[PDB]
Write a structure and sequence with these properties.
- Chains A, B: Pfam families: ETX_MTX2.
- Chains A, B: It comes from Bacillus thuringiensis.
- Chains A, B: This is Cry51Aa1.
- Chains A, B: InterPro entries: Aerolysin-like.
- Two copies of one chain form a homodimer.
- Chain A has two helices and 19 strands.
- Chain A has 305 residues and is mainly β.
- Chain A has one domain.
- In chain A, a hairpin with a 2-residue loop joins β10 (195-196) and β11.
- The longest helix of chain A has 16 residues, at 5-20.
- In chain A, 38% of the residues are buried.
- The interface between A and B is large, with 56 and 56 residues.
Chain lengths: 305, 305
């Protein structure tokens, strides 16, 4: 859930009040105090960090783009030709907070973070592969509403291919992608715009006639016996880190292959020969063995001793 | 357990052999082959990484060192004196592999890694605190035997203290430490000293007369249907990462305080007054509010509006 930090602060104040006056020397604030006697607008959220719980089970992929290039040689000499693809695709992430916090109902501005996430994946025919993708993730600890972010990438594939005399070679680019659900921790640190004696002031406590006030320091929040589980200990700078959580839905292209089909130039109905470029290209630009993502186990010759 | 990678490699070879000869073009290796027909000594373990599963429950501490310094003023003028402590302590870690692997029973050389680990801790009186310690961890994926490592640190505490006329002030240093059990992942990557077509060769397969051989490439290991769970997919460089595990026992000093007791110089039997230095010192050298680790809630004055 999205916890109401203002309510929790009020509850902590009303716990300590009758016991030690929240450390304030003097005053009659009239415990239990009303929410009208505090003002938590000075609370800040700092150092936000998404920490993915990286996927380990190889994920299924689907074709997300396919296109062709036609290469022709109507001469009697073999020609070294070059096939080049340049395709822009957009990775999308949709991130929703499961556990988070808000100061009294306030919705903070959504922030964006680049995060590296593991993408284990299955090739055509069932091959198991591992890679990593860096993508933009939007996040907002104050609401469960989905936060969208886009990351544009470019698939740049260049390939020399030997085109025999009187042949047409068709090159087919296929990009495989998937939809992945990635849970992450979302840590945010509670601090304040105001401090006293080294402690964030989570609110001032006003007397019922608003004539005087005293500060509510973070020590009293961190050490409040009924503090909910997601709130951490006092940090070395007297802030308190909340360990929240999100789930992100990630739609991304993962790898691309190039297939070649050769035809007699006079008969473009019948494929004479088919083969793949020896490497596939990953999202992150790395090249991997084509055998890893197709039904072609790698072969080798015998060696004499 | 410590898996026998040599046995697993043999099993993978004998799975694929009758089906596609492990991709080797020709030869009669006589499946199922004997362990005598392989040699996995070329397998390497690379990129070892300890990844702690960081502790979140604040841990209990005990006094691990205490010493004193005596400051004396037999004059009629207050004196600003300085108390200084310099104490060396040694953090120890003892790390045992739960899940790992060995090549045929071989025990690799133990390696050492500096790792940062979270240390949530409880102060005197119950205060909750958070810190981090960097320490040496020894690790060895090939054996369950404990691997020890030491990390020396220095506690340097310097404090001016105002000593009234005709008083003795005794400064007592107390260092609190604990014993923590930290589970970690231990990732190691399987590679080889030899490669063919971009793939690590996990072994050569020899004919029964040792007259010829063919390479067993990593593709066949990663895609062997009975591969045990800890072995990952093919990486982008055709290696295979094993996700192993260790448990480490960590003995470390966490924080230090300095207490002052004041006596009339003529009566060293009766404490007149006691107070603490306003900050404690952490293992990592940072200073924290003394209130965080003692039974002294922070106080504040009232402010007029």
């Amino acid at each position: 859930a999205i916890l109401d930090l203002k309510s929790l602060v009020l509850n902590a104040i009303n716990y300590w009040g009758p016991k030690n006056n929240n450390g304030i020397q003097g005053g009659d604030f009239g415990y239990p105090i009303s929410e009208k006697q505090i003002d938590t607008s000075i609370i800040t959220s700092t150092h936000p960090r998404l920490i993915p719980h990286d996927l380990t089970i190889p994920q299924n992929l689907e074709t997300i783009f396919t296109t062709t290039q036609v290469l022709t040689n109507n001469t009697d000499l073999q020609q070294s030709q070059t096939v080049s693809f340049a395709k822009k695709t957009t990775t999308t992430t949709s991130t929703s907070t499961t556990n988070g916090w808000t100061e009294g109902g306030k919705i903070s501005d959504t922030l964006e973070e680049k995060v590296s996430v593991s993408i284990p994946f299955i090739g055509e025919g069932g091959g198991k592969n591992s890679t990593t993708i860096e993508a933009n993730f939007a996040h907002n600890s104050s609401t469960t509403t989905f936060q969208q972010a886009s990351t544009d990438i470019e698939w740049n594939i260049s390939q020399p291919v030997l085109v025999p005399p009187r042949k047409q070679v068709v090159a087919t680019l296929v990009i495989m992608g998937g939809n992945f659900t990635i849970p992450m921790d979302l840590m945010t640190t509670i601090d304040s715009t105001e401090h006293y004696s080294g402690y964030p002031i989570l609110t001032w406590i006003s007397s019922p006639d608003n004539s005087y006030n005293g500060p509510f320091m973070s020590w009293y929040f961190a050490n409040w016996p009924n503090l909910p589980s997601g709130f951490g200990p006092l940090n070395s700078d007297n802030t308190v880190t909340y360990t929240g959580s999100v789930v992100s839905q990630v739609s991304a292209g993962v790898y691309a292959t190039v297939r070649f089909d050769q035809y007699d130039i006079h008969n473009l109905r019948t494929i004479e020969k088919t083969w793949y470029a020896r490497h596939a290209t990953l999202h992150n630009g790395k090249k991997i063995s084509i055998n890893n993502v197709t039904e072609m186990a790698p072969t080798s010759p015998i060696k004499t001793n």
